[PDB]
Each structure stands twice: as structure tokens, then as C-alpha cells.
Design a protein around this ligand. Structure first.
Ligand SMILES: *[C@@H]1O[C@H](CO)[C@@H](O[C@@H]2O[C@H](CO)[C@@H](O)[C@H](O)[C@H]2NC(C)=O)[C@H](O)[C@H]1NC(C)=O
Ligand SMILES: *[C@@H]1O[C@H](CO)[C@@H](O[C@@H]2O[C@H](CO)[C@@H](O)[C@H](O)[C@H]2NC(C)=O)[C@H](O)[C@H]1NC(C)=O
Ligand SMILES: *[C@@H]1O[C@H](CO)[C@@H](O[C@@H]2O[C@H](CO)[C@@H](O)[C@H](O)[C@H]2NC(C)=O)[C@H](O)[C@H]1NC(C)=O
Ligand SMILES: *[C@@H]1O[C@H](CO)[C@@H](O[C@@H]2O[C@H](CO)[C@@H](O)[C@H](O)[C@H]2NC(C)=O)[C@H](O)[C@H]1NC(C)=O
Lengths: 473, 473, 473, 473
């Protein structure tokens, strides 16, 4: 006698409108949510882009100001090869630091006291770390090394408007040289979006790295950015961001309404599932129910609930960022982008009621079991290839340096991408061992053949077979 | 009794020739049109290439003449990093401008009076734009900024055969520095195609951009080209372009004849459609007709009519360009190229009568409904991925800078192109946040899997199923 | 009664051996031919590589010796931008020419008298070509140009052990500057293959190209190489090339024997075809024969005859090259490589008798008719796209410069290669017209969709359908 | 009566546990082996990476110390073009060698006595090799060459704390100039993994190569590394590598146990095969057995035996390396990586008992016969294309230099990778012969069409047909 109720619970919004006159509130709510969430993501991306751009541009400016003879595009090859070059680089960094206000285009401030843990209240720390004792005498094939690391720190202070020139580097046992300092600045470009510029404290660490002890000392500059509210900010306020706050409260309201409607649908689905279970337990036997329960739960509405929870969390983080309580642009950006993707995907719920528009979703729901079973056997081969290539070809091949990079290289190879570059990276140097080159040939040829021609063909065949299963309604 | 008439309206030109002795006028007219339109496109492309080459080469010469230390291939990285560098760059630009006739290889003319809106009748304008007041004191974590933009303009004039050296830049609140001037020249290379060279006025704007306020000021040069007839041109006229005008009048005549014949075919198709409708309304019931009307209309002839309208418009624009009434080479080039593509495609009309030669068109006409239904579900996923990647990975990934660039990157990824470059762009910098790098990994892996392995397989399966439907006639 | 004869003419060499005891002479002859022809190709490639390397390395050395400030990898961007730069480049070329024996690493000789047609018996010709009269006054928007080309030649002579410094360039009407000279040298590296080094005369032409009249004069160096026998060569002859001549006479003998055997097989096939025709004309009606004739002709043996004719021609050209009667390494290399490919392909004749090993050939012979019918419709779309992209995007896109380059770009795009590079070439410059950029977007997206997703799918489907037709024997 | 025994020998570990209560010892042993072998591979890769990094970084430092004007990324284009440049390069190398301890960042030692075979007990050998007599007079088109190679050696010795400046190069007959010396150093970075640093002797050979005699002398530096134990090593020993030795003995024990269990399974399989053979010989006729023997042998257990033999060999080589008896990191790395890949693959043995998880293996075992039969015909075409492209396009195309490179290029082309780069390499230079360019067009187009569109389609069709054969259990 509830068979028509079950029919009502499982028909399209058009059918529900024709039957009980129920307007598709959730469909139009989802469309509105797509609009507002995408707009909110773009609006947040404006300020996110300003923050990232400020950090990256300041880092590039620091590299040009403090690294001697630095040119763009040579970060990986920037190195010193003679003692004079290393001394000149270190001294150039410190001298440019001392004359920074006179030369720099940006308005940078000396963070007096902040020069790292090695600093004893000074602004810049020029540290050399070497072995406790290192008697490297390769001529006699004798060395006497105490692996304990001693650090000699020269503390440099900007004038309020010298010593570091007496640096004596112990090249035979030098582990590294580092320069730590901090710089304050204000991100004025925030004003283009009617925000209040913040204070950015850049912790700059310049490393002259001798850990390889190979006659070549790479030189690198790194910055850690700390963003905080300005203590005394004064702006004439030629506008505001009411357009931001409107789209934020609208997003919150739409997501809360979606949460309520979807939770109500989950609850009624549970109630109808229990009603069906008891009806079939009185009619048929007991413990009959095994999967009808999961047929009752709407996974699309679970997705909508999760996505709007994510959107609410991202909006709250965004609002806190504009309130400047927290400044974590990466996490907020990830939350908002993931929520935007999920709200765009969630509108496919209403495309399921039509088999002509449900080819992708139905094929997926039919193929995923077989796809996972196939991937169980595929994954062990893939992981064995990953580890073998990472350790054997890692030292020699630029695309096999790290496990993640090896995975990316192999995954791209499965799709026939950068094959000749992968071969030529080994070809250009013969691996400095003909054996390693021959192994690379065998490894790459076998992997490409087995995964493009064999594994991928079967994967596509499984997906096409699922589609063939669901071709006719 | 009209059944043989309907047969006559729906048979091939060979059948029409065998039945009523009708020569295939439209077929041979289309072949002639292909020839003449392609030749006209190439002939126009000669002068179009001369114009584009002149503009691009003059811009490169300007960049080498006015940008200090400029080298090719470094447009994006060209920047100043110290106050001395910025002053030297600005002064070098102005000095090279002042000595241009003495140094430049091209015969450039000073456009006296034209120096932009900021110019008060002078030829060159050296403008600095800064905040109305900017008290950036990052040391005290205090700033006082009035976001109103004040512009100080130095007006520089070439001698008829100094002041700008007293420029005082306010680096703490400088928004940008700009140099505007104009240069006249004559595109003499036009003579190689028996055309009269025109006057090109290049509006050159050099921007030293400090809007980021990040210690790094990018330096760029842009030109806006204005092409106009020379006031007093004198050429000894060693030839003409009657070969151009012949192929232009022939194109116009062929396109008009095609328009007439196709319009006549559309009219007779409409008349026969109405005759069939009334015959079946007297024989069968009423309102019977629903799609036979669209079976009567020949879409190929609609395409031919549209394409020859486009060709006539492009030819008229071309003729006006040679007459120098209008100089809009981009629009004319687009019109002529689109018309050439459409006239080449239109010759497929006569390949439809043969099922062995109609595999592509018939498969398309069968698959497009299902393809569009599938793309309705595919497009929301694609757009969600586009927006998410554009906002989250845009600041970090060079291939995600803009929405169009994100779309191109994702579309290329669907075809397994530049996968490892996309992965390595994030890998090389770790996203400056391990979280963002992990998100990029998840984003790229999920997108590539879902679209290459799943979505694309289904798309190809739909097309192949349509082909299977039409495999046998 | 001849039915067993026809059976004998159409069975495998193993069947022929089991029936009439006929050894497979042609199969082993083909294997021997593969060996000897491949070895001969490699042996010729040694000397071919020496010749090409000598030409390329001499050209690079010339570019470094005669082009001021030249660096490798900047051939396309090498240009002059000021009058002083152009004068310095020209004078540097001439001065380096005059002091060549003192500075150059190679032993170059001055070709006294050979300086081009513009030379009046002098070794170097410094020519400037300009308009007969050119009164370019862009300031008054007036020009007076006589398009006749006047050439002023300065004749420079190396000392037997000045004037050219008085060059006055007419920049306002200069078409180009050229430097022609010739240099003799001896390719001593030939001795590593026991050959006699030849005399190479390099005709060097340095062009300062002002045909664009755009303030930027590209500078390029080209060499034309003439190889001829040395007049008085003296080598102590530490070996010979009997190993070459043995493999050349063996190739000639094997190819002639293959030609004889295949011609005999063609003749007997013709005789049996005529015998079958007359037998079926006496048995059945007349004019019965239509295709059995082409079933009788063995296309594989026609291929073998053509390939061994090519191999004989290539071997004769090779022998003439070692005899130094003719020195045309490119034509001989093309002939020998094409013959090597054809002899490797010809061994597939004997793989046809087995259906398990004949999948590729049988599928081809079944699919080529349908493939050509499909390509008839595909080719018009491809050509329309080619012409449209070549003329519209040619000026702007680096991959659309020429029709062959456009074809290569589109063909690579069909296979999903360099998609993002094609998009980004337009993206990086916005086409200098938003309209052209939008057209490029539409053009590329439509082409890629239609050819990868639609056309290629149908092509693969046709090939797979042919395979399905021949899946079972 | 043994039918249940045969059933027992051919059921899954779960079935064996349910029947006879046999725990799956080999499955858990294989999982443990995967863990321990992968961990051992990573642990060895740490030290392998240190060794390779030390060699590569020392080579880069040597190139920067001894090559005049050297910059990274220009190894292939590094060359001298004038006599002064060559003299300056040679003298700079020798002078930098003489002042190495004063300038170099690394602690290098002079290997007194070791300067190559050309050295008469001196540390550095500056050798020039030229012809016995070479009277190259290209002006008179006459040369007199004795191909015997004379070597003039200047012996340079570092001071214990000049002559080589009198070098007179015979450029007209110079074959090459070489500088041989040796340098000792200690790889201190080994201490980061609690190893004892070794002594590395680098044999440095700098070649100024004039074998082309083309005015351009490439300059290259090569190092051969010899690693040996330090004679008197002293380290305070802040730790050990018991974590390494534990995982090495565990690997040895696990591999030996796997070897024993798999050998026992092979033996019982042989015994049951013989028992079945005799039972069916008493029941049915004789010589009945033909393939049941190979159905009895478990190929997976053969793979496991081979893989654990490889793992034991690699572990023994590793232990010897830490013991410093032998220092062959490449061979040990290859062994350990191959064993890791094989142990990861071997866990697929237990996935065969389930048809849903055995799609890949079953398809392979069904498709490999047909795949090999197809590849028999494919390989001759591929090899003919390889040889033809290698010899004809090798001199001109950068991707066709060597046979292995040609194979990689063609294999990548089969997968639609670097197509436009392959076309553009010929396009950029027109092959310096329009004929060669046209041949390259025909060659590349024909190869790509035939292998992507035709050969690859058939290959995928064969694999898919095998899958279709095994789709249902
Ligand atoms: C310079 O070398 C020292 C000595 O190796 C490094 O100090 C180590 O730093 C890491 C991370 O900061 C710590 O986990 C270790 O405990 C430190 N000591 C040792 C002995 O490893 C230091 O990191 C190096 N500096 C740079 C910038 O690389
Ligand atoms: C230099 O900076 C000024 C100040 O921001 C820019 O002026 C703006 O220009 C745009 C477009 O020309 C206008 O829409 C705005 O109204 C202007 N004012 C402001 C406050 O934005 C100017 O464009 C910059 N110059 C360059 C070359 O980038
Ligand atoms: C320098 O400019 C002159 C003038 O344009 C060029 O001379 C032409 O050369 C081509 C081919 O050599 C001939 O077909 C023409 O008849 C010549 N005259 C004209 C008016 O075109 C000359 O080729 C240019 N030199 C270089 C190296 O480009
Ligand atoms: C410098 O040139 C000499 C002369 O050609 C080369 O000497 C040959 O070296 C190879 C391998 O070392 C030997 O097989 C030959 O027998 C040597 N002589 C000849 C005549 O070939 C020498 O290898 C060259 N040096 C370098 C570094 O290339």
C-alpha cells in the first residue's frame, strides 16, 4: 500500500511537480549556489593572487639584490667554484644588506633583533658551520674527522644612521655558510581591492651549501613570509567591500538552506528505508534487507551536504582573513576551490533521472568495481616500477629524482607524454655507465609497452564494456 | 502523382543528368570557387604578412633602442631592482629618443605634439604616478596612504636642429613611471607587392610598473600602430596589381552566382515542401508535418549561402583596404580565412549522395545529439575543474594564470599533452606550500584519470556506436 | 586439367618444396640482400656523415669568425639595431676575412677571383643595394621612391704577403648589404675511412637584410659547398676500402639475381594468366576476365624489382662517388636508404602465406579502399583548415609560418602533440588583436575536436572493421 | 584415485586452508619480502645517490675550474674558433691546475706520477697529436699527408711548495690536444649515512678535438672515477648502520626461505606431473603427454626463485660494498632495483585464482602468441625505417644521430610524442638540401600514418580480442 510512496520518493523533480505540485527548490538552489560560490571563489582569488604575487616578487627582488651575478632562470645552477667567488658572494650579500635602504626600490625595514636563533639580538647572522675537527689530507689518503658541527656566528647590525670582512672560511671542513636576516614591508597593492595593506616580515636565509664537499658550492636564497595586521594603519578609504560581504552572507545562507533540505531528504530516506524493511519483514522473511538500504540513501545529497559544509568552512576562513584574525590563504583557497568543484559536480544529481544524459555517471557506477579489481593487479606493477626507477635511475635521470616525480613521469608515460625526453635524458649522458643506460632502455621500453599497449587497452575495454552494458535503458 | 518530382529533388547531380540532362553547374562552380577563394586568400596574405611583419619588427627595434640592456627572449623577466637601475633605464630611454635620427637604422619621424593625453603639446611625456600621500614606515608598522593618484609629467621635446635629468622618483609611493611618444615611418616593403607604402604612426608606451610595490619593477614597451595613407606618395610604378583585381572580381562573380543558384534551390525546396504538406493533408490528416519540413531544407546550401556572403564581405573589405579607405587587416584576414575554410568544407555537399564517401558526415549527423547530451554532463565537471584550478593553482602554476589558459591546459591534458610539464611546474617550487602541492597532485591526477580514461573513452564509444549504426547502408 | 598447375603457382615455398622439391632461392636471397644492403647503407653513411659534418662545422666556424658578437643558438635573433652596430658588423666581417690565415684554426685558402658575379676579379665583394632614388620624409608624410635597385660594390682583395672603410650606407633607402667571398679547404677527416680528402670550396654570403625597412636588420651567414677532387693528392695509403668494394659488388650481384628471378616469376605469372583466360574462355563465355589478371600479378615481386633497381642505381651512384666522378651525397643517401627500407619491407612477401602472420598486410589490403574513400572527405576539411590557419595565423603563430609547417602542426595536433604550445603561442601575445586571438581559439578548438575525437575515431573504426572482417581465416 | 590430489595441487591458498588447514606461508612471506626488499633498495639508494652526486658535482666543478669561459648548459657548443682562443684555453687549464690548491673550494690532491700513459712520471700531460707530415696547401689544391700520428708531450709537474708556455701547435695538421691529470679527494658526505668516506681518484682528460679539421675545435672535459678505501681513516663514530645490517640479513633469510618453499613446490609439481603421466599412460595410450607437463610447472614460482636469487646476489654485492671489498654501485643498484620490481610483480601469483582480479595476466597469456606473430611482420618494417632514418636523416636530424636514438624517436612517434619537434628539426634548416627535406617529409608522414593509425590499431585490437575471449569465466 506504500508502493506509490516509494514511487514518489524515486521520481524526478518534473515528475514530482506533475504528481504533487512540488517545485524543484533544490535544483534552483543548486544553480544559485553554483553562481554565488564561483563568484566568491573569484573574489577571494583576487586577494589570494595579490598575496602570492607579493611574496614571489619580493623573493625575486631579494635574489637580485643579495646574490652576486644572479640572473633569472639559473636558480638550480647558481654556485661558487673558487674561494674568491665564495668570499665575494658572501661579502656582496652582507654589503647589499647594509646599503639596502639606499639602493632598494621597495621600502624595506630592518627587523632589529630578528636574525634567527644564531643571532644574539643582532639583525643579520653570518654563520659558518664546519666539523669539530677535519684533517682532510687526501694526498696521504688519510683523514681525521669529528662529525660534530661547530658554528661560528658573526653578528652584523645595520647602522642606526667591518667585522664580517674578517671571515676566515675553513674550506677543508666547511659544511655550509648561511646568512639569516629579516625584512619588513607593506603590501600596498592590497588597496586596489579596497583592503588594508598588511605587514609582511620576510625571513631571508641565504645558503652556501658545501655538504657535498665537491668543489662546487650551490648558492640559494629562501624566504619565509609572515603576514600580520599593521599596527597603525591609515587609509583615506576610497571605497569598501560590501560587494564581498554580500556574496559571502549569500553563500552562507544558500549553503545552510541546502544543508537543511538535504538533511531532511536523508532523514525521510532513512524513514522510508525502515518502513520498507518492516513491510518486507512482515510480508517476506527476516534479515531480507542487505542492499536496499544503500539503494535508499542518496549519495548525491551526501555529496551536497559535504560540499556545503566545506563551502561554509571556506567562507568562514575567508571572512576571518578579511577580518585579519587569521592569514592562511592557501588553506582557504584550497577549501573554496574544492567546494566550487564539488558544487559544480553536484548539479549532476538532477541529470541522473534521464538515461540519455546519464551515460558518464551510470558507466562509472557500473565500471568502478571492475576498474578497482583491475587496478589491484596494476598497482603492484606500477609501484615496483616506481621504486625501481626511483632508486636506479634517480641519480642519473632528472625526471626520476623523487618518488612523487617518478610517479608523475610514469603516469605521463602511460599517456605517451615526454617519452623522447625521458629517453634522451639518459641518452645525453649514457648514464655514465653503459650498464645503467642499457637498464634504462629495458626499463622504459618494457614499462611503456606493458602500460600503454596492454594495461591501458584493458582499462578502456573495461569502461567500454560497462557502457555497452548500460547502452540500452 | 508528384512522387517522381520528389525523387527528382532528392537525387545526385549524376542522377539528375541521366534523368533530365541537367549539368552539375553548382558542383563545378564550387570547385572554381575553391580555387579562386584560396588564391585570393593567399594574395591577401602577402600584404597582411607585410603589415604584421612591419609592426612586429618595428616593436622589436624599439625595444632594442629604448630599453637598457635589453636582450631578446627576456621580455617577461625584464625588470629593474635598484634605484640606480631604474634611473638609468628611464634616462637611457629618453636619451635614445633624443638621438634617434642619429643612431636608428629606420627612418623614423618625430610626431611633434603627439605625446599622449599627459602631453601638453610636447612629443615625449615622462610621467610618474604616485599616491597623493604615502607615509610608508614599515619599521614602526605604520602607514598613512591616500589612494588618490597624482601624476607628475615632464614634457620632453626633440630639438628642431636637460630638464628630465632632474627627475626625482618617490619610490616609497611610486605607482608607475611611463614614457609616451609617437614615431612616424613608411612601410617601403609594400613596394614588393606593387602597393603604395603607407604611413605608420607607432604610439610607444614604456611602462616601469611598481604597482606590486615589491622591490622589483618590470619594464615593458608596447606599441599601438595606426596605418593611414601617405599624404604625398610618389612611386615610379614598375607594375600594378591587375592580377589581384581579376581574382577579386572573379571571386565576387562566382560568389554571387552561387548565391543565386543556392537561393533558387532553397526557394524550390520550400515550394516542394509546401506542396508535399498540402498533398499529405488532403490524403492523410492535418498537422501531420513535423520534421519533413527540415528534411526538405538543404543545410548544405544554407552553408554555401552563408559562406559566399562571408566571401563577398571579405572581398569588399579587401578591395577597400587596397583602396586604402579602411585599413583593418585582422578583420579582413579572419573573414577571408573563414570563407576559405567554409568553401573547402562546402564541396562535401556532393559527397553525401554516396554512403561510402559519407562516413564522416553521416556519423556526425547521427552522433551529435548523443554527443551533446553527454557533453551536458561533461561540461559542468570541466567548468568546475577550470574554476578550481584557475583560482587555486593560478597564482602558483604558470599554465593556470587565466581562465582561457586554464581551459587550454585542461583541454590539452585531456589529450595527454604536457602532462609532465604541468606536474613539474608544481614540483619545481613545491607550490611554496606543501598543502597546495598535495592539492595540485590530487587535482591533476583526478582530472587526468576521469577525463582521459573515462570521459574520452565514452565519447569515442558514442561516436563509434553512431558509425556502427550507419555501417551498412 | 591445369588446376594443379594453378595450385602450384599459388602455394608457399614450403609447399613448393614438399611438392616439387624447389628450394626457396628467393627467400634466402632476400635475407642475404637485407644483410648486404643494410651493411652497404651503413658503410656509405660513414662517409656521408663525414661530408655533412665538415660542411656544418665549417659553416659554424665561419659564423663565429665573421659575425660580430655571434653566439650559438641566436641565428634567428641575430640583428643590428643602430647605424654604428651595422658598420661595426660589416667592418668586423671584412677585417676578419683579411686576417683569416693568422687567426683561423682551419687551413683556409683565398679563392682569388671568386667573389661572386658582383666581383670584378676580386676575392671579396662588399655590395650595398638601395633604391635608385628614395626620398623618405615621414615627417611630411611624403616619399619619392624609384623602385629600381642600384648596387654599389667595393672590391676587397686579400694581400699577397683601406677602401672598404669608406663605406657610406644609405640607410633611408638601403635594401641590403652583402659580403660574398669564397674559401678553399681540404676535408682531411676523410682519411679515417681510407678515402682521399677532397677540396671543398665554400661560397660564403653574409646578408644584412633591410628589406623590411623596420629599424631592425637581420644578419645571416650562408655557405654553398662545392666538393671536387684534389688536383695533386698525396697520401701514404695506410689502407684501402676493399671491404667497401666487396659489399658493393655483392649488392650488385644479389640485386641482379633478384631482378632475374622476379622477372621470371612475373613472366610465368603472365603466361599462366593468359592460359587461364583462354581455358575459361573455351569453357565459359568471353570477356569473362576482369580481375583474375590482377590476382595473377604478384605485387610483392613488382616491389622487389623496383627496390633492387633502386639499390643498383644507388650502388652505382655510390661507386661513382668513391671514384669521385660525381659528388652528390644527398641523392645517393636517399636512394640507398629508400632501397634499404624497401628490401626490409619486401621480406614480408613470404609472411603472407600464413594468416596468423599476415594480420597487418591483409587488414591493409582490405581497409585501403574504405580508408581512401574516407580520406576523400577528410582531405578537403584538412586543406581548408591548412590554408585558413596558414594565412590568418601565419603572421602571428610561429608554427603556422609556411604551408608545410601548417600541415605538420595540424598533423601533430591530430595526434595530440604540442597542443598547449600551439595555444600558448597565441596566448603569449594575444595575437596583438583580441579578434585574432578569439579566431585562433575557435579555429584550434574546432580542429582538434573534429579531427581527434571524430575523424580519428572513424579512421580507427574502419581499420578495426577490416581486421574484424579478416579475423577468421 | 589421485584426482583429488590434483585438485589440491591446483587450488587457492584459501581453498587449501579450508581443505587441509594449510596457512598461506608463501603469500605472507612474499608480502614481508616486498617490504624488506623495497626498504633495502631505498637504504642502498641513499649511499648510491651520494656516490653519483659526488662524481657529477666534482665533474661540474672541474669543468668550471679548468675550462675558460665555461658556462653551464653549453657543453655541446663549447668550442674554440681562433688560434688565440685555443692557446688561451690550454694555458688557462694548465695554470688553474697549477694554482688549484689556492683557488679550489674542494680539498683536491695532486696525484704525483699519475698523468696517463703519455706521462713520464709527471702529474700532468699536455699532449698534441698531429700527422707525421701534413702539407695542406688548399690554395694549390695540393696536399701531402702521412696518416701516422705523432704525439708531442709536455710534462707538467705541480710545485712541491714555464715550459708549457712554449707550446707550438701545428694547426694545419693537428689532430687533437689533450690534457691528462689526476686528482684525489675524499667523499666526506658519506658521514651523513654513518659510512666511512672513501678516496676518489678522478682521472681528468680535457680534449681539444680537431679531428674534423673544420676550423672549429670542440673542447670537452671527462672524468673517470676510481673509488677505493682510505688508507688511514679516522672518524669519531657518532653512530653505526645496524639498521642496514638488520634489513640485509632479514632480506637474505626471507629470500632463502622463499627459495626453499618454491623449490619444494617445483619438486612436488614435477612429481605430480610424472604421476599423472604414468596414470594416463596406463589408462590411455602412450606418448599422450605434450603440454600437461608445462601446465604442471608453476611459472610464478620460477619467477620467485629467479627474483630471490637476484635479491641474494644484490644483497651480497651491497654487503661487499659496505665492507668496501668491491665498489660497483651501478651493478648493485641494477640488481637491487630489478629484484624489487620482480618481488613486487611476484605478488600477482596469488591474484590468478580469481578471474575478476586476473584480467591483465589472463589477457597477456592469451594475447602474447598473436602479439608475437604480429610483431614478426611489424619488426621488419620498424627496422627498415630505423636504418633508413638513421643513415639518411642522421647527419641532419638531431633525433636521428644514433641507432638507439633513432629507435627511441620512432618508438615515441608511434605514441604521438615529439612529432612537431621531429618535423621542425628538419624544417628549421630545410635539411640544407630540398631533396633531403622532401624525403624527410615522406619518411615521417608514412611512418606515423602506418604505425599510429594502422599498426597500433591492430595491436590494440588483438589485445582487446584476447580480453573478449576471456571476458566471461
Ligand atoms: C648547515 O649544516 C648544518 C650541519 O649539517 C645543518 O644543521 C642541521 O639542520 C637540520 C635541520 O635544520 C637539523 O635537523 C640537524 O640536526 C642539524 N645538524 C646536523 C648535524 O644535521 C643545517 O641545516 C645546514 N643549513 C642549511 C641551510 O642547509
Ligand atoms: C599607472 O598607474 C595608474 C594608477 O593606477 C594607472 O591609471 C589607471 O589606468 C586605468 C587604465 O588606463 C584606468 O582605468 C584607471 O582609472 C587609472 N587609475 C587608477 C587609480 O586605476 C595607469 O593605467 C598605470 N599605467 C600603466 C601603463 O599601467
Ligand atoms: C638584396 O636585395 C636585392 C634587391 O631586392 C635582391 O635582388 C633580387 O634577387 C633575387 C634573387 O637573387 C632576384 O630574383 C631579383 O630579380 C633581384 N632583384 C629584385 C629587385 O628583387 C637580392 O636578392 C637581395 N640579397 C639577399 C641576399 O637577399
Ligand atoms: C686524439 O687523436 C688520436 C689520433 O687519432 C686518437 O688516438 C686513437 O685513439 C683510439 C682510442 O684511444 C685508438 O683506438 C687509436 O688506435 C688511436 N689512434 C688512431 C690513429 O686512431 C686519440 O684517441 C684522440 N684523443 C681523443 C681524446 O679523442
Amino acid at each position: 500500500d506504500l508502493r506509490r510512496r516509494l514511487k514518489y520518493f524515486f521520481m524526478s523533480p518534473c515528475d514530482k511537480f506533475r504528481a504533487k505540485g512540488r517545485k524543484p527548490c533544490k535544483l534552483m538552489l543548486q544553480v544559485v549556489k553554483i553562481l554565488v560560490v564561483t563568484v566568491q571563489l573569484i573574489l577571494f582569488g583576487l586577494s589570494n593572487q595579490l598575496v602570492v604575487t607579493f611574496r614571489e616578487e619580493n623573493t625575486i627582488a631579494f635574489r637580485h639584490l643579495f646574490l652576486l651575478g644572479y640572473s633569472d632562470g639559473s636558480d638550480d645552477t647558481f654556485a661558487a667554484y673558487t674561494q674568491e667567488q665564495l668570499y665575494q658572494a658572501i661579502f656582496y650579500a652582507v654589503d647589499q644588506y647594509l646599503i639596502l635602504p639606499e639602493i632598494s626600490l621597495g621600502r624595506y625595514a630592518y627587523v632589529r633583533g630578528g636574525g634567527g636563533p644564531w643571532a644574539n639580538g643582532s639583525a643579520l647572522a653570518l654563520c659558518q658551520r664546519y666539523y669539530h675537527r677535519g684533517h682532510v689530507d687526501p694526498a696521504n689518503d688519510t683523514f681525521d674527522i669529528d662529525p660534530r658541527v661547530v658554528t661560528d656566528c658573526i653578528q652584523v647590525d645595520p647602522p642606526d644612521r667591518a667585522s664580517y670582512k674578517n671571515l676566515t672560511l675553513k674550506f677543508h671542513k666547511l659544511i655550509n655558510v648561511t646568512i639569516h636576516f629579516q625584512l619588513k614591508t607593506i603590501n600596498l597593492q592590497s588597496l586596489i581591492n579596497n583592503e588594508i595593506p598588511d605587514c609582511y616580515t620576510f625571513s631571508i636565509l641565504i645558503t652556501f651549501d658545501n655538504k657535498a664537499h665537491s668543489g662546487r658550492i650551490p648558492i640559494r636564497l629562501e624566504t619565509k613570509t609572515h603576514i600580520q595586521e599593521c599596527k597603525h594603519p591609515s587609509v583615506s578609504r576610497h571605497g569598501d567591500n560590501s560587494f564581498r560581504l554580500l556574496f559571502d552572507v549569500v553563500v552562507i545562507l544558500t549553503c545552510s538552506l541546502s544543508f537543511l533540505l538535504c538533511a531532511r531528504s536523508l532523514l525521510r530516506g532513512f524513514l522510508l528505508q525502515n518502513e520498507f524493511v518492516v513491510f518486507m519483514w512482515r510480508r517476506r522473511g527476516r534479515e531480507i534487507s542487505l542492499w536496499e538500504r544503500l539503494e535508499f540513501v542518496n549519495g548525491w545529497y551526501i555529496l551536497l551536504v559535504t560540499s556545503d559544509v566545506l563551502t561554509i568552512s571556506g567562507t568562514v576562513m575567508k571572512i576571518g582573513i578579511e577580518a585579519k584574525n587569521l592569514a592562511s590563504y592557501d588553506v582557504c583557497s584550497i577549501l573554496l576551490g574544492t567546494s566550487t568543484l564539488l558544487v559544480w559536480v553536484g548539479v549532476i544529481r538532477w541529470l541522473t533521472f534521464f538515461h540519455k544524459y546519464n551515460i558518464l555517471i551510470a558507466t562509472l557506477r557500473v565500471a568502478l568495481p571492475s576498474v578497482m579489481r583491475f587496478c589491484c593487479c596494476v598497482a603492484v606493477i606500477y609501484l615496483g616500477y616506481c621504486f625501481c626507477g626511483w632508486i636506479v635511475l634517480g641519480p642519473y635521470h632528472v625526471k626520476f629524482r623523487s618518488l612523487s616525480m617518478v610517479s608523475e613521469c610514469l603516469f605521463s608515460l602511460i599517456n605517451g607524454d615526454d617519452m623522447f625526453v625521458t629517453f634522451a635524458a639518459m641518452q645525453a649522458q649514457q648514464g655514465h655507465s653503459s650498464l645503467v643506460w642499457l637498464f634504462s632502455q629495458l626499463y622504459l621500453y618494457s614499462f611503456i609497452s606493458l602500460f600503454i599497449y596492454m594495461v591501458l587497452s584493458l582499462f578502456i575495454a573495461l569502461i567500454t564494456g560497462a557502457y555497452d552494458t548500460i547502452k540500452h535503458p
